[PDB]
Amino acid sequence: TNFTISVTTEILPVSMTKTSVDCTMYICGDSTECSNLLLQYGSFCTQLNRALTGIAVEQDKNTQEVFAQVKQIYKTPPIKDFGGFNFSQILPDPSKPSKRSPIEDLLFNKVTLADAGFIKQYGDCLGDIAARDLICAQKFNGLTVLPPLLTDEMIAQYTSALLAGTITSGWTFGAGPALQIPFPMQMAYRFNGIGVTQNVLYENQKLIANQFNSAIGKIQDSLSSTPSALGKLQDVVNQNAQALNTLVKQLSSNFGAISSVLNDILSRLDPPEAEVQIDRLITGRLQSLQTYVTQQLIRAAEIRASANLAATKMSECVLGQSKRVDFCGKGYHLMSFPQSAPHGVVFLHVTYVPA
Amino acid sequence: CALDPLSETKCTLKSFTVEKGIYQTSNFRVQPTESIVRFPNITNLCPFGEVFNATRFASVYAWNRKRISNCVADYSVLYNSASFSTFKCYGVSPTKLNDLCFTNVYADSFVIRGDEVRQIAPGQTGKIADYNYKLPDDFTGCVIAWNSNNLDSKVGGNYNYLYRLFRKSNLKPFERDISTEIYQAGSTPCNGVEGFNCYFPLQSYGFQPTNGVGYQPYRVVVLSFELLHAPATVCGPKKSTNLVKNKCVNFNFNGLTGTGVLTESNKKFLPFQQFGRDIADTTDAVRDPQTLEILDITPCSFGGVSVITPGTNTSNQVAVLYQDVNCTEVPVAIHADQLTPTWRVYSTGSNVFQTRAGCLIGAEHVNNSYECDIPIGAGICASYQT
Amino acid sequence: EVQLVESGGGVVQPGRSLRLSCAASGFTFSNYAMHWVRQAPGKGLEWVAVISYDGSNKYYADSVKGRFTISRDNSKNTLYLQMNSLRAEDTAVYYCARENNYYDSSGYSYYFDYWGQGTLVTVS
Amino acid sequence: EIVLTQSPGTLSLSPGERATLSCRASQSVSSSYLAWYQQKPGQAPRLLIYGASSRATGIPDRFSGSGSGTDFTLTISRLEPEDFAVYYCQQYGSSPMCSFGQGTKVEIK
Ligand SMILES: *[C@@H]1O[C@H](CO)[C@@H](O[C@@H]2O[C@H](CO)[C@@H](O)[C@H](O)[C@H]2NC(C)=O)[C@H](O)[C@H]1NC(C)=O
Ligand SMILES: *[C@@H]1O[C@H](CO)[C@@H](O)[C@H](O)[C@H]1NC(C)=O
Ligand SMILES: *[C@@H]1O[C@H](CO)[C@@H](O)[C@H](O)[C@H]1NC(C)=O
């Protein structure tokens, strides 16, 4: 006799932390003799940097397949005559210094890099502006967080372009630019494509409009308090952070040497007696970097598969709707209402489950 | 390699033709170094082996722990004295031992058999190894021994030298037990006197020239070079140079040999903290051994370079990207400006650009917006316009 | 302003465990060394412990060593004092203090510039 | 191991004159690595003298201390009513340890 539009967070990771280890001065920091011993190794870490360089570039592409689907950076029309719809709860707000929404303020405030190692450090090091600090990339061990190519303002503006385009101009805007249409002209094929007679909407637009306002009130009530409900990106910025800390804690390990430091093992011993110990330090730190690069590649394949899933979830599905059952996710699916997130995308369904 | 930013993308990818893209590269090259040597006020004239000689060689059950304090000690003479039969040094090189400092030197003189400096070693087996003089497994010091058949023996040998071979427990490391107690081996008790199945656990050596080499007299001095959090009281002949601040060189401070740029510090210590460490236990700050002044170590020869280029098919005009360097004349100091020219153009001059990804110098800044063909990072993109 | 806001007090049974926390704000916590400082009721004052800016250099007092232990975490600007096996003579007010060093050419002077607000710890 | 001794344990004087406090060590304390503090009663201690000779910030010139070797003194002339509190001597050099004295509370006579 009725239906529910139980909109949920479909949290999927776009990217990871854009990392960059410098191999030569992670393994042999503050030593020229150790750099010459890694030259006898030779091309066994720069390729690793090249590997992470390739990894870094694909995080950029994982933004561009999701948010930059449309060809024009369109703005919303300045009147908010959406039809009783509180789309300012998902549109960017220019009154804030960063163009975000009151649900995206919770997205910026739920997932935290606080208890993470190194990402917490390399993060407010850029927000020093107090001492000289010298280099954030050198004072913090040799590990490096690259900044993303597309920041949060342009990612939220690319959400804002399709939030203009979907409601104020129909589903037809994905083929090219925003092609304006009335909103009852947008709804004409939409209810008839899911087998529901459209006159109930056109006699009760206030009721279904307030139902969609109740759905965004439901995601307000869900995303207000629960910390695990934004868990998976939190899990990602847990896990890679663990994969950062497991790197730096393996400089405290010994790997069969007499010291976990390089300065004492090159000061106390002649390198005729110490090459066999410093090469143990080389192969220990280098297998630590090998384990980091293979875990980051296996996770990067997982994050790429999730990012092409999120990009595919509104690829053709902005440009139309389904024909068979569950082609775009759950139920008699209608459209997509994405937001932005730290290191990912956080998503809103449009469903239909009868009652 | 050390001439242009284009000339060092051309070395990090081993190809004379680069393409169009942002190229994260390697070392900034050249960087001339010298040396800084600073080691403290010193007392001089040290208790060497010249006071660890002659008569009154200490007992093997009643040795002492000779507290060698403030002195300078040339450790090369004790290696090159050419009278000592066995040196085996434990994580410290014997040859280059003179290039270090420690807080104290612990020498321990005792006389043992000829088959027992294979047992005076870390973590050994046998009775008189673990019941008479124990060493830790992570020991940082040498073992010195030589034959003393013509000095440590009389007619019939000494009955003053007594190793212990029975005890109910193994010793702790470096532990002394000067007891003269009878021990019990069997059912009938001893109670201060000897008798049936009572062994006297101290045992007199047999020191004769007719006796065997494996039981010959053989004094052992073990030097424990421990490294506490005190100032270095004992050192070696390391004649001292000056203190030049900035300009990255290799240095040595209380035996901590490193390489870095030396700056003034804003950092506060303790009464005797000579070394300040790091999260991943490297070095961040060192107390000066002479003037007790705070210092700071940071690496040089790097800034965070990623040279953007339109490819060598187009032209050789490039631009750079430092990552966390905010270019208020700071990469005069970050990029340590003693490099050759045709780099200093792309360090500080005109075309200064401030970005969240750090500074890009060597290219235009345009108030309009265009397309991206070479992405850079933090919302900026360059190109190549003619 | 500088603030060494500390917490961890109350009534704790003997033989239990506790963890006093000295959070810091207004300065760089990894730039200065740290001090735990205690005062019995009605007596004078008794020193507890010192840890450096990094944690590699810890020292404790004579009636302190073993049970008391000290640590820090620089990412949250917090000092940690961990309590194992409490005894009824350790009823005291505990204070966190920082070590500021006025350098001169003739030596190196030492003082306690900034303090906490005192946390009462009673063992009964 | 340096123990620190003060005399008296509590002093009581009228306001307006000089107040004399003394501190005494166990060894020869080198170069005066000590300090003087004001524990206002119920409150945290507040630093007055550092190095047994030099005043701190927010600390006037009415507090003045001196000493060498073993006997160490503090002189506070013109006793204001905010100057009646518990004062300490506190070593921190020579040993790695920090040691306090037993102190003196200044009262009203
Ligand atoms: C005291 O010990 C020292 C060294 O252990 C011995 O002194 C050396 O004696 C030779 C000749 O006997 C000299 O050529 C060296 O210059 C000496 N000094 C060294 C090596 O530092 C000395 O023989 C010992 N005295 C005794 C055993 O009575
Ligand atoms: C750049 O960093 C220096 C640090 O020496 C600082 O003085 C300056 O204010 C900074 N400029 C900006 C714009 O942040
Ligand atoms: C001894 O140390 C003082 C500082 O404590 C220093 O000024 C002096 O130069 C040192 N002596 C020598 C010979 O360097």
Coordinates of N, CA, C and O in Angstrom, one line a residue, chain A residues 87-207:
Chain A
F87 N 17.7 20.7 -0.4 CA 18.9 20.4 -1.1 C 20.1 21.2 -0.7 O 21.2 20.8 -1.0
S88 N 19.9 22.2 0.1 CA 21.0 22.9 0.8 C 21.7 22.1 1.9 O 22.8 22.3 2.3
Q89 N 21.0 21.0 2.3 CA 21.6 20.0 3.2 C 22.6 19.1 2.4 O 23.4 18.4 3.1
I90 N 22.5 19.1 1.1 CA 23.5 18.4 0.3 C 24.3 19.4 -0.7 O 25.3 19.0 -1.2
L91 N 23.7 20.6 -1.0 CA 24.4 21.5 -1.8 C 25.6 22.2 -1.0 O 25.4 22.3 0.2
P92 N 26.7 22.5 -1.7 CA 27.7 23.4 -1.1 C 27.1 24.8 -0.7 O 26.3 25.4 -1.4
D93 N 27.6 25.3 0.4 CA 27.1 26.6 1.0 C 28.2 27.6 0.8 O 29.3 27.4 1.4
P94 N 28.0 28.7 0.1 CA 29.1 29.7 0.0 C 29.2 30.6 1.3 O 30.2 31.3 1.4
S95 N 28.3 30.5 2.3 CA 28.4 31.2 3.5 C 29.6 30.6 4.4 O 30.2 31.3 5.1
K96 N 29.8 29.3 4.3 CA 31.0 28.7 4.8 C 32.2 29.0 4.0 O 32.1 29.3 2.8
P97 N 33.4 29.1 4.7 CA 34.6 29.4 3.9 C 35.0 28.3 2.9 O 35.6 28.6 1.9
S98 N 34.6 27.0 3.2 CA 34.7 25.9 2.3 C 33.3 25.6 1.8 O 32.5 25.3 2.7
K99 N 33.1 25.5 0.5 CA 31.8 25.3 -0.1 C 31.3 23.8 0.2 O 31.5 22.9 -0.6
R100 N 30.7 23.6 1.4 CA 30.2 22.3 1.8 C 28.8 22.4 2.3 O 28.2 23.4 2.2
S101 N 28.3 21.3 2.8 CA 26.9 21.1 3.2 C 26.9 20.8 4.7 O 27.9 20.5 5.3
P102 N 25.7 20.9 5.4 CA 25.6 20.5 6.8 C 25.7 19.0 7.0 O 26.0 18.6 8.1
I103 N 25.5 18.2 6.0 CA 25.9 16.8 6.1 C 27.4 16.6 5.8 O 28.1 15.8 6.4
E104 N 28.0 17.4 4.9 CA 29.4 17.3 4.6 C 30.3 17.9 5.7 O 31.5 17.6 5.8
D105 N 29.7 18.8 6.6 CA 30.4 19.2 7.8 C 30.6 18.0 8.7 O 31.6 17.9 9.4
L106 N 29.5 17.2 8.8 CA 29.6 15.9 9.6 C 30.6 14.9 9.0 O 31.3 14.3 9.7
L107 N 30.6 14.8 7.6 CA 31.7 14.1 6.9 C 33.1 14.6 7.2 O 34.0 13.8 7.3
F108 N 33.2 15.9 7.3 CA 34.5 16.4 7.6 C 34.9 16.2 9.1 O 36.0 16.2 9.5
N109 N 33.8 16.1 10.0 CA 34.1 15.9 11.4 C 33.9 14.5 11.9 O 34.4 14.3 13.1
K110 N 33.3 13.6 11.2 CA 33.2 12.2 11.7 C 34.6 11.5 11.6 O 35.2 11.1 12.6
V111 N 35.0 11.2 10.4 CA 36.3 10.5 10.2 C 37.4 11.4 10.5 O 37.5 12.6 10.1
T112 N 38.3 10.9 11.4 CA 39.4 11.7 11.9 C 40.7 10.9 11.6 O 40.7 9.7 11.7
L113 N 41.8 11.7 11.4 CA 43.1 11.2 11.3 C 43.9 11.4 12.6 O 45.2 11.4 12.6
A114 N 43.2 11.5 13.7 CA 43.7 11.9 15.0 C 44.6 10.9 15.6 O 45.8 11.1 15.9
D115 N 44.1 9.7 15.9 CA 44.9 8.6 16.5 C 45.8 7.9 15.5 O 46.5 6.9 15.9
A116 N 45.8 8.2 14.2 CA 46.7 7.7 13.3 C 48.1 8.2 13.5 O 48.3 9.3 14.0
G117 N 49.1 7.3 13.3 CA 50.4 7.8 13.4 C 50.8 8.4 12.1 O 50.1 8.2 11.0
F118 N 51.8 9.4 12.1 CA 52.4 10.1 11.0 C 51.4 11.0 10.2 O 51.8 12.1 9.8
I119 N 50.3 10.5 9.7 CA 49.2 11.3 9.1 C 48.7 12.4 10.0 O 48.5 13.5 9.5
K120 N 48.6 12.1 11.3 CA 48.4 13.2 12.3 C 49.5 14.2 12.4 O 49.3 15.4 12.4
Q121 N 50.8 13.6 12.3 CA 52.0 14.5 12.4 C 52.1 15.3 11.1 O 52.1 16.5 11.1
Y122 N 52.2 14.6 9.9 CA 52.3 15.3 8.6 C 50.9 15.7 8.3 O 50.2 15.0 7.6
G123 N 50.4 16.8 8.8 CA 49.1 17.3 8.6 C 48.8 18.6 9.3 O 48.3 19.5 8.8
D124 N 49.2 18.6 10.6 CA 49.4 19.9 11.3 C 50.8 20.4 11.2 O 51.1 21.5 11.8
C125 N 51.7 19.7 10.6 CA 53.0 20.2 10.2 C 52.8 21.3 9.1 O 53.6 22.3 9.1
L126 N 51.9 21.0 8.2 CA 51.6 22.1 7.2 C 50.8 23.2 7.8 O 50.8 24.3 7.4
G127 N 50.1 22.9 8.9 CA 49.4 23.9 9.7 C 50.3 24.4 10.9 O 49.7 24.7 12.0
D128 N 51.6 24.4 10.7 CA 52.5 25.1 11.7 C 52.3 26.6 11.7 O 51.5 27.1 12.4
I129 N 52.9 27.2 10.7 CA 53.0 28.7 10.4 C 53.4 29.4 11.7 O 52.7 30.2 12.3
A130 N 54.5 28.9 12.3 CA 55.0 29.4 13.6 C 56.5 29.4 13.8 O 57.1 30.4 14.0
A131 N 57.1 28.2 13.7 CA 58.6 28.1 13.6 C 59.0 28.1 12.2 O 58.1 28.2 11.3
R132 N 60.3 27.9 11.9 CA 60.7 27.7 10.5 C 60.3 26.3 10.0 O 60.0 26.2 8.9
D133 N 60.4 25.3 10.9 CA 60.1 23.9 10.8 C 61.0 23.1 9.8 O 61.2 21.9 10.0
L134 N 61.7 23.8 8.9 CA 62.4 23.4 7.7 C 61.5 22.6 6.8 O 60.7 23.2 6.0
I135 N 61.5 21.3 6.9 CA 60.8 20.5 5.9 C 59.9 19.5 6.6 O 60.4 18.9 7.5
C136 N 58.6 19.5 6.2 CA 57.8 18.5 6.8 C 58.1 17.1 6.2 O 57.9 16.1 6.9
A137 N 58.6 17.1 5.0 CA 59.0 15.8 4.3 C 60.3 15.2 4.8 O 60.5 14.0 4.6
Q138 N 61.2 16.0 5.4 CA 62.4 15.5 6.0 C 62.4 15.3 7.5 O 63.1 14.4 7.9
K139 N 61.8 16.2 8.3 CA 61.8 16.0 9.7 C 61.0 14.8 10.1 O 61.3 14.1 11.1
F140 N 60.0 14.4 9.3 CA 59.2 13.2 9.6 C 59.7 12.0 8.8 O 59.0 11.6 7.9
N141 N 60.9 11.5 9.1 CA 61.5 10.2 8.9 C 61.9 10.0 7.4 O 62.8 9.2 7.2
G142 N 61.3 10.6 6.4 CA 61.5 10.3 5.0 C 60.2 9.9 4.3 O 60.2 9.9 3.1
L143 N 59.1 9.7 5.0 CA 57.8 9.4 4.5 C 57.2 10.7 4.2 O 57.5 11.7 4.8
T144 N 56.2 10.7 3.2 CA 55.7 11.9 2.7 C 54.3 11.7 2.3 O 53.9 10.7 1.7
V145 N 53.4 12.7 2.6 CA 52.0 12.7 2.2 C 51.9 13.7 1.1 O 52.1 14.9 1.3
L146 N 51.7 13.3 -0.2 CA 51.4 14.2 -1.2 C 50.1 14.8 -1.1 O 49.1 14.1 -0.7
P147 N 49.9 16.1 -1.4 CA 48.5 16.7 -1.4 C 47.8 16.2 -2.7 O 48.4 16.0 -3.7
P148 N 46.5 16.1 -2.6 CA 45.7 15.7 -3.8 C 45.7 16.7 -4.8 O 45.9 17.9 -4.5
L149 N 45.6 16.3 -6.1 CA 45.5 17.3 -7.2 C 44.2 18.0 -7.2 O 44.2 19.3 -7.3
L150 N 43.1 17.4 -6.9 CA 41.8 18.0 -6.7 C 41.4 18.1 -5.2 O 41.3 17.1 -4.6
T151 N 41.3 19.3 -4.7 CA 41.0 19.5 -3.3 C 39.5 19.3 -3.0 O 38.8 19.0 -3.9
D152 N 39.2 19.6 -1.8 CA 37.8 19.3 -1.3 C 36.8 20.3 -1.9 O 35.6 20.0 -2.1
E153 N 37.3 21.5 -2.3 CA 36.4 22.6 -2.8 C 36.0 22.2 -4.2 O 34.8 22.3 -4.6
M154 N 36.9 21.8 -5.1 CA 36.6 21.4 -6.4 C 35.8 20.1 -6.5 O 35.0 19.9 -7.4
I155 N 36.1 19.2 -5.5 CA 35.3 17.9 -5.5 C 33.9 18.2 -5.1 O 32.9 17.7 -5.7
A156 N 33.7 19.1 -4.1 CA 32.3 19.5 -3.7 C 31.6 20.4 -4.8 O 30.4 20.3 -4.9
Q157 N 32.4 21.1 -5.6 CA 31.8 21.9 -6.7 C 31.4 20.9 -7.8 O 30.4 21.2 -8.5
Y158 N 32.2 19.9 -8.0 CA 31.7 18.9 -9.0 C 30.6 18.1 -8.5 O 29.8 17.5 -9.4
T159 N 30.4 17.9 -7.2 CA 29.1 17.4 -6.8 C 28.0 18.4 -7.0 O 26.9 18.0 -7.4
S160 N 28.3 19.7 -6.9 CA 27.3 20.8 -7.0 C 26.8 20.9 -8.4 O 25.7 21.3 -8.7
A161 N 27.7 20.6 -9.4 CA 27.3 20.7 -10.8 C 26.2 19.6 -11.2 O 25.2 20.0 -11.8
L162 N 26.4 18.4 -10.7 CA 25.4 17.4 -10.9 C 24.2 17.5 -10.0 O 23.1 17.1 -10.4
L163 N 24.3 18.1 -8.9 CA 23.1 18.5 -8.1 C 22.3 19.6 -8.7 O 21.1 19.6 -8.5
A164 N 22.9 20.5 -9.4 CA 22.2 21.4 -10.3 C 21.5 20.6 -11.4 O 20.3 20.7 -11.7
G165 N 22.3 19.7 -12.1 CA 21.9 19.1 -13.3 C 20.8 18.1 -13.2 O 20.0 17.9 -14.1
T166 N 20.8 17.3 -12.1 CA 19.9 16.2 -11.9 C 18.4 16.6 -11.7 O 17.5 16.2 -12.3
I167 N 18.3 17.6 -10.8 CA 16.9 18.1 -10.4 C 16.5 19.2 -11.3 O 15.4 19.2 -11.8
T168 N 17.3 20.2 -11.5 CA 16.9 21.4 -12.2 C 16.9 21.2 -13.8 O 16.4 22.0 -14.5
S169 N 17.4 20.1 -14.3 CA 17.5 19.9 -15.7 C 17.2 18.4 -16.1 O 17.5 18.1 -17.3
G170 N 16.8 17.5 -15.3 CA 16.5 16.2 -15.7 C 17.6 15.2 -15.6 O 18.7 15.6 -15.1
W171 N 17.4 14.0 -16.0 CA 18.4 13.0 -16.2 C 19.2 13.2 -17.5 O 20.1 12.4 -17.7
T172 N 18.8 14.1 -18.4 CA 19.3 14.2 -19.7 C 20.6 15.0 -19.7 O 21.3 15.0 -20.8
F173 N 21.1 15.5 -18.6 CA 22.2 16.4 -18.6 C 23.6 15.7 -18.7 O 24.6 16.3 -18.8
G174 N 23.6 14.4 -18.5 CA 24.8 13.6 -18.5 C 25.5 13.4 -19.8 O 26.7 13.1 -19.9
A175 N 24.7 13.6 -20.9 CA 25.2 13.4 -22.3 C 26.1 14.6 -22.7 O 27.1 14.4 -23.4
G176 N 25.8 15.8 -22.2 CA 26.5 17.0 -22.5 C 26.5 18.0 -21.4 O 26.9 17.7 -20.2
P177 N 25.9 19.2 -21.6 CA 25.8 20.2 -20.6 C 24.5 20.1 -19.9 O 23.7 19.1 -20.1
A178 N 24.2 21.0 -19.0 CA 22.9 21.0 -18.3 C 21.8 21.6 -19.2 O 21.8 22.7 -19.7
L179 N 20.8 20.7 -19.5 CA 19.7 21.0 -20.5 C 18.4 21.2 -19.7 O 17.8 20.2 -19.3
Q180 N 18.0 22.4 -19.5 CA 17.0 22.8 -18.5 C 15.6 22.3 -18.9 O 15.3 22.3 -20.1
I181 N 14.8 22.0 -18.0 CA 13.5 21.4 -18.2 C 12.7 21.7 -16.9 O 13.3 22.0 -15.9
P182 N 11.4 21.7 -16.9 CA 10.6 21.7 -15.7 C 10.7 20.4 -14.9 O 10.9 19.3 -15.4
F183 N 10.6 20.6 -13.6 CA 10.6 19.4 -12.7 C 9.4 18.4 -12.8 O 9.6 17.2 -12.7
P184 N 8.1 18.9 -13.1 CA 7.1 17.9 -13.5 C 7.4 17.3 -14.9 O 6.8 16.2 -15.2
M185 N 8.2 18.0 -15.7 CA 8.6 17.3 -17.0 C 9.7 16.3 -16.8 O 9.9 15.4 -17.6
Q186 N 10.4 16.4 -15.7 CA 11.5 15.4 -15.4 C 10.9 14.2 -14.8 O 11.3 13.1 -15.2
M187 N 9.8 14.3 -14.0 CA 9.2 13.2 -13.3 C 8.2 12.3 -14.2 O 7.6 11.4 -13.7
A188 N 8.1 12.6 -15.5 CA 7.1 12.0 -16.4 C 7.5 10.6 -16.7 O 6.6 9.7 -16.6
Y189 N 8.7 10.3 -17.1 CA 9.1 8.9 -17.4 C 9.5 8.2 -16.1 O 9.6 7.0 -16.1
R190 N 9.8 8.9 -15.0 CA 10.5 8.4 -13.9 C 9.6 7.4 -13.1 O 10.1 6.3 -12.7
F191 N 8.4 7.8 -12.8 CA 7.5 6.9 -12.1 C 6.9 5.8 -13.0 O 6.7 4.7 -12.5
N192 N 6.8 6.1 -14.3 CA 6.3 5.1 -15.2 C 7.3 4.0 -15.5 O 6.9 2.9 -15.9
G193 N 8.6 4.3 -15.4 CA 9.6 3.3 -15.6 C 9.8 2.3 -14.5 O 10.4 1.3 -14.7
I194 N 9.2 2.6 -13.3 CA 9.2 1.6 -12.2 C 7.8 1.1 -11.9 O 7.6 0.6 -10.8
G195 N 6.9 1.3 -12.8 CA 5.6 0.6 -12.7 C 4.6 1.3 -11.7 O 3.7 0.6 -11.2
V196 N 4.8 2.5 -11.3 CA 3.9 3.2 -10.4 C 3.3 4.4 -11.2 O 3.9 5.1 -11.9
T197 N 1.9 4.5 -11.0 CA 1.2 5.5 -11.8 C 1.5 6.9 -11.2 O 1.4 7.1 -10.0
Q198 N 1.8 7.8 -12.1 CA 2.4 9.0 -11.8 C 1.5 10.1 -11.2 O 2.0 11.2 -10.8
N199 N 0.2 9.9 -11.3 CA -0.8 10.9 -10.8 C -0.8 11.0 -9.3 O -1.3 12.0 -8.8
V200 N -0.3 10.0 -8.6 CA -0.2 10.1 -7.1 C 0.8 11.1 -6.7 O 0.7 11.8 -5.7
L201 N 1.9 11.1 -7.5 CA 2.9 12.2 -7.3 C 2.4 13.6 -7.7 O 2.5 14.5 -6.9
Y202 N 1.6 13.6 -8.8 CA 1.2 14.9 -9.3 C 0.0 15.5 -8.5 O -0.4 16.6 -8.7
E203 N -0.7 14.6 -7.7 CA -1.7 15.1 -6.7 C -1.1 15.3 -5.3 O -1.7 16.1 -4.6
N204 N 0.0 14.6 -5.0 CA 0.6 14.7 -3.7 C 2.1 14.9 -3.9 O 3.0 14.1 -3.5
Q205 N 2.5 16.1 -4.5 CA 3.9 16.4 -4.6 C 4.5 16.9 -3.3 O 5.6 16.7 -3.0
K206 N 3.6 17.5 -2.4 CA 4.0 17.9 -1.1 C 4.3 16.7 -0.2 O 5.2 16.7 0.6
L207 N 3.5 15.6 -0.4 CA 3.7 14.4 0.5 C 5.0 13.6 0.1 O 5.7 13.3 1.0

